[PDB]
Amino acid sequence: SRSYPCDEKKQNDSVIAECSNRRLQEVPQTVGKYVTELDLSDNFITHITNESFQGLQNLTKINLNHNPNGLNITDGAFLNLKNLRELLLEDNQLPQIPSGLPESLTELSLIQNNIYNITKEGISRLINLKNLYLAWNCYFCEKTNIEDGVFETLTNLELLSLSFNSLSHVPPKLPSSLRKLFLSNTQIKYISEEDFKGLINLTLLDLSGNCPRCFNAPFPCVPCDGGASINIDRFAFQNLTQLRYLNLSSTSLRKINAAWFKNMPHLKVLDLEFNYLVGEIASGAFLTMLPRLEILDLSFNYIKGSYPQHINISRNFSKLLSLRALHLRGYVFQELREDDFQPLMQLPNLSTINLGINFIKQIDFKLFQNFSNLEIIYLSENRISPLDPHSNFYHFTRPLIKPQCAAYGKALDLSLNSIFFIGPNQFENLPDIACLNLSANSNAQVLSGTEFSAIPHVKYLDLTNNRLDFDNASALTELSDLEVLDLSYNSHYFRIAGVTHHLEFIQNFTNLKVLNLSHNNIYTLTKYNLESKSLVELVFSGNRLDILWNRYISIFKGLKNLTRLDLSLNRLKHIPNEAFLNLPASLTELHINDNMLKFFNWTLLQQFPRLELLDLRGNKLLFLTDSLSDFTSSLRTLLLSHNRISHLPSGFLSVSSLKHLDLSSNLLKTINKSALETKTTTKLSMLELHGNPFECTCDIGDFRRWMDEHLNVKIPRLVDVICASPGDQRGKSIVSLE
Ligand SMILES: *[C@@H]1O[C@H](CO)[C@@H](O[C@@H]2O[C@H](CO)[C@@H](O[C@@H]3O[C@H](CO[C@H]4O[C@H](CO)[C@@H](O)[C@H](O)[C@@H]4O)[C@@H](O)[C@H](O[C@H]4O[C@H](CO)[C@@H](O)[C@H](O)[C@@H]4O)[C@@H]3O)[C@H](O)[C@H]2NC(C)=O)[C@H](O)[C@H]1NC(C)=O
Ligand SMILES: *[C@@H]1O[C@H](CO)[C@@H](O[C@@H]2O[C@H](CO)[C@@H](O[C@@H]3O[C@H](CO[C@H]4O[C@H](CO)[C@@H](O)[C@H](O)[C@@H]4O)[C@@H](O)[C@H](O[C@H]4O[C@H](CO)[C@@H](O)[C@H](O)[C@@H]4O)[C@@H]3O)[C@H](O)[C@H]2NC(C)=O)[C@H](O)[C@H]1NC(C)=O
Ligand SMILES: *[C@@H]1O[C@H](CO)[C@@H](O[C@@H]2O[C@H](CO)[C@@H](O[C@@H]3O[C@H](CO)[C@@H](O)[C@H](O)[C@@H]3O)[C@H](O)[C@H]2NC(C)=O)[C@H](O)[C@H]1NC(C)=O
Ligand SMILES: *[C@@H]1O[C@H](CO)[C@@H](O)[C@H](O)[C@H]1NC(C)=O
Ligand SMILES: *[C@@H]1O[C@H](CO)[C@@H](O)[C@H](O)[C@H]1NC(C)=O
Ligand SMILES: *[C@@H]1O[C@H](CO)[C@@H](O)[C@H](O)[C@H]1NC(C)=O
Ligand SMILES: *[C@@H]1O[C@H](CO)[C@@H](O)[C@H](O)[C@H]1NC(C)=O
Ligand SMILES: *[C@@H]1O[C@H](CO)[C@@H](O)[C@H](O)[C@H]1NC(C)=O
């Protein structure tokens, strides 16, 4: 009773089927009639008829995106499905909206299609529709033909997205129940008082990309004639009292009318990126009309040809009492003084200040102490010196600073700047910084224990992509509370023959939990051993453990409390038995992937009683031990993908703790009865076997019966478990055979 070709999983008593990216020519008739959600996306399906979903009467959600990776849908093909609530038909090259859609539809997505006419024959009958997506249809068809009153009968429509279409004007006769109206990149150059007549429950309005400021856009960008901006009438948003989100990004706006926000007391998010509002930032009457605004974005509003000495922030900025995040990227100015940010120091909830990509040469860092609740100071891509159609295409939605860093406390990001060395006055007059990012600064500082004395409570320090010298035993030891140190891609700049690398600084830390020394080109150590009582995770990938491997046999033996160790990309051909035995016994996860290991001594796993995860992927191993149970009694996950293993030993499954065995992309031709003969019951939950040259002859029948007898062992990617021989069964799955 194993499902094929879908990976069926019971989620909240509703069986879902994941049949995506499986190279399916047609809709499969081998799907259980009890499934509710079906995902047939990224397949080569070309035709949809009224017999495709025959028998599956409990289908509440159908996904047919990117088919074929156009789609021919007959009239009333989905009409038989009386329980269909969600239908996704994105990127299907549909010329028109499918006629005969079921009335029980609540969410319809027709994004990235060739739909030029929005007619009543395919839309008006769908009165239960709550969400309607019609983006990227008549994008770059001179204009989208919207039938007058096509959305009138949809009295339950809460979301209408007509983005990236040649609309030219807001469609009239829209339902009053509309909560979110998306009109981004719609060529609507004029907004009138009558355009949004009866939208009293409208909480979101997106009018971005209309008369745009072309700044490295991922989609075509054509500005309005004569540098014109979007023409919004004085009383256009006078009836939208419940507006919370207003997106006016890339609208070439030069002046903001404060009268727009007179009847908008709940406006929480205002987007004004890619405009020409430098004058509005300096005076702005509209700043007094936004008392409940929490997110304000005025990024990339710079004036061409000018690089002002200071940022001109209006005193009216003090009237944004609810402000939490201020985004001011791309303003482009030379210096930030304490007096420039005076109208922001009294805002009680302002926790995020985004000043990235501003080319600031010097900052008066004492001004940050003047703030009350600052938690994120993002200053990346500046000049500080020593001492997807479902995406937000204008606002930076991803976390400015990594969540694992910001969780420790006050976060300051000084990455991609001109701090080529840590000056003596580098961090003076700074708040109590708990997260610091000095990444990609070409920093060649010879660390000695005094550089971070002004900010000694840094718990997460990111020093990636620099030329730092940390050979001194006192390096970084002034950060007594340091928990996470990131030194990835650190190329030493002052290498001493009998000194580099000297990792003695690590043992001084009483609370260092995670150390990342990846891609540091560590081929020699000098006190050669690494010791630490608090270290839990060490990343030593992209180093030269092959050159090191008898002075470096017990290299990580002193890390008595280490649970995670990454030894990938070290060019290891053969790990010495004495060196492997001297690895920390406390290890729970060991990653020796992407190396060149020809042999692995499985007997050595006896000295690691807590080892649950063993990663040996991307290697050249040919043999497996026939008595793995005699060496381990805790190994829950064993990853051996992309190896040269051609035979599974007798009783390899007969280790009890093993719940995940990955033998994909190997050289296994067949799984014989000796390897499957288990007297004791196995506890395996997942067995990956795709990418193997299986012989689909009578020899594979023994393993075929084991798959039917053991339905608890989930085998993923059944369509990728391909037979190499014979010519008749070549290409077919091992589950589809006599
Ligand atoms: C102009 O400005 C407006 C306002 O900021 C932007 O509107 C946002 O647009 C994006 C993209 O269309 C919306 O993002 C999507 O939201 C969906 C709903 O999420 C909410 O609800 C769930 C619970 O149902 C919560 O868990 C969640 O926190 C939210 O509160 C998500 O389902 C979407 O997720 C899917 O897509 C993303 C991106 O591919 C994936 O990363 C996810 O894994 C997932 O597959 C997505 O997040 C956003 O909600 C809109 N805001 C509002 C308030 O509606 C405009 O986009 C912007 N215009 C332009 C052109 O930039
Ligand atoms: C230098 O080395 C360090 C240490 O290895 C790296 O930092 C770690 O990077 C990994 C990712 O490579 C981080 O792990 C990820 O954490 C995410 C957030 O975790 C929170 O949420 C989960 C629940 O979702 C909680 O359990 C957890 O406690 C946190 O609250 C997760 O979302 C990620 O999960 C995804 O990947 C894993 C596989 O890795 C899947 O199993 C998941 O299903 C999911 O897809 C992931 O776990 C880790 O947190 C980082 N540690 C620190 C200390 O920051 C550096 O990135 C590295 N530097 C460079 C330049 O490479
Ligand atoms: C410290 O600062 C550096 C530099 O700003 C941070 O590195 C940056 O991290 C982000 C997020 O991981 C990367 O963005 C992503 O890049 C990929 C590839 O281009 C893209 O596909 C994603 O959509 C996204 O934009 C960014 O490239 C990377 N920058 C560099 C130069 O490597 C780092 O994360 C910061 N560290 C902490 C602790 O916050
Ligand atoms: C649909 O689900 C119900 C249980 O919710 C079940 O009784 C019924 O037989 C199912 N019908 C089909 C056709 O699967
Ligand atoms: C600040 O945020 C809290 C919620 O975190 C809220 O209760 C409070 O009213 C906000 N203060 C102001 C002045 O907006
Ligand atoms: C805060 O800034 C004001 C000037 O804007 C200054 O007089 C005051 O001393 C500063 N206080 C601190 C603690 O930085
Ligand atoms: C190493 O650091 C200590 C402590 O700051 C310092 O006294 C010493 O001079 C440094 N060593 C070298 C070689 O600079
Ligand atoms: C091991 O590491 C954890 C996390 O850093 C720490 O809390 C614990 O005290 C350490 N245990 C010993 C015995 O050193």
Ligand SMILES: *[C@@H]1O[C@H](CO)[C@@H](O)[C@H](O)[C@H]1NC(C)=O
């Ligand atoms: C494993 O290592 C031990 C020494 O620790 C050695 O005696 C044994 O022969 C090795 N086994 C293999 C298969 O190399």
